[PDB]
Design a protein that fits this description.
Chain E: It comes from Oryctolagus cuniculus (Rabbit). The structure is cut from a larger assembly and holds two copies of chain A and three copies of chain B. Chain A is mainly α. In chain A, 44% of the residues lie in helices and 0% in strands. Helix content of chain B is 8%, strand content 0%. The chains are: A mainly alpha, B little secondary structure.
């Protein structure tokens, strides 16, 4: 019970940061170099 | 003739082929039946 | 290893050395494991029969012994058409 | 009856080995694409 | 390969699990980074 104000603060902070990120980085991470004339993402051995 | 005999219409998908991976080749023999190297009669099947 | 002389010839539109017998070992088999070092040691007595067979009938093409361990031994010796990584392609061949 | 147990798993390879051992056969394990060429070609050593 | 005597030569690595797109890589008996050979390495591993 006594964690109620802390829970509300965490919820409000998560909401603010979600909205901020939604404004700034909305749709940027949608490009990666495939192979030319191919739909195979090109990465080195251990890269993600 | 020295070319390998074919089966079905060939279909290759370029969009899913890395550039340098050396997709392998075939080991099939050249098995061309007798009634497929000439025109088939009802007499040539008898001779065969 | 042996370094050959590799004269050129007809009946093989490539380079050929009639003095010893080549050897081909699948790429993913170690060339120096004990199971292949014996198949390389006891098959060293085939080259005499290879040479005799060709000396009798001079018009013979490849004579090959393909053992149950991948090790192939053919005569006359000739560089394999596909090295491991000297071209851009690899060699997926297996006598079995 | 040659019996091939393919892939990696936590199942019981007992009855399959028994079928192989009883009916003049052989039991092969294929846990990867690497071990496919040398396992699907060894049954000849049993037919000889 | 289950021994340091066997882990030599080259082997095939298949990209995307595609058995028709392979590369050659030399195999090597690699000792894990964090191990348990001595109490020093074991204390390091337990620390991590």
């Amino acid at each position: 019970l006594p964690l109620f104000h802390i829970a509300l603060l965490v919820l409000f902070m998560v909401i603010i940061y979600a909205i901020i990120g939604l404004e700034l980085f909305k749709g940027k991470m949608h490009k990666t170099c495939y192979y030319i004339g191919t739909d195979i993402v090109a990465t080195v051995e251990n890269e993600k | 003739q020295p070319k390998p005999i074919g089966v079905g219409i060939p279909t290759i998908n370029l969009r899913k082929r890395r550039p340098n991976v050396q997709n392998p080749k075939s080991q099939e023999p050249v098995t061309l039946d007798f009634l497929d190297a000439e025109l088939e009669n009802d007499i040539k099947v008898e001779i065969r | 290893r042996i370094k050959p002389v590799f004269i050129d010839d007809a009946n093989f539109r490539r380079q050929v050395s009639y003095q010893h017998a080549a050897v081909h070992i699948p790429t993913d088999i170690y060339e120096g494991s004990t199971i292949v070092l014996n198949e390389l040691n006891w098959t060293s007595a085939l080259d005499d029969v290879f040479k005799k067979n060709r000396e009798e009938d001079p018009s013979l093409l490849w004579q090959v012994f393909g053992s149950a361990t991948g090790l192939a031994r053919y005569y006359p010796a000739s560089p394999w058409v596909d090295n491991s990584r000297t071209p851009n392609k690899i060699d997926l061949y297996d006598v079995r | 009856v040659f019996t091939f147990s393919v892939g990696q798993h936590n199942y019981d390879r007992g009855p399959i080995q028994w079928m192989a051992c009883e009916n003049k056969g052989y039991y092969y394990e294929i846990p990867s694409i690497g071990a496919i060429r040398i396992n699907t070609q060894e049954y000849l050593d049993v037919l000889g | 390969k289950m021994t340091e005597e066997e882990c030599r030569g080259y082997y095939y690595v298949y990209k995307d699990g595609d058995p028709t797109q392979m590369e050659l890589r030399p195999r090597q008996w690699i000792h894990n980074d964090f191990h348990f050979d001595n109490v020093l390495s074991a204390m390091m591993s337990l620390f991590t």
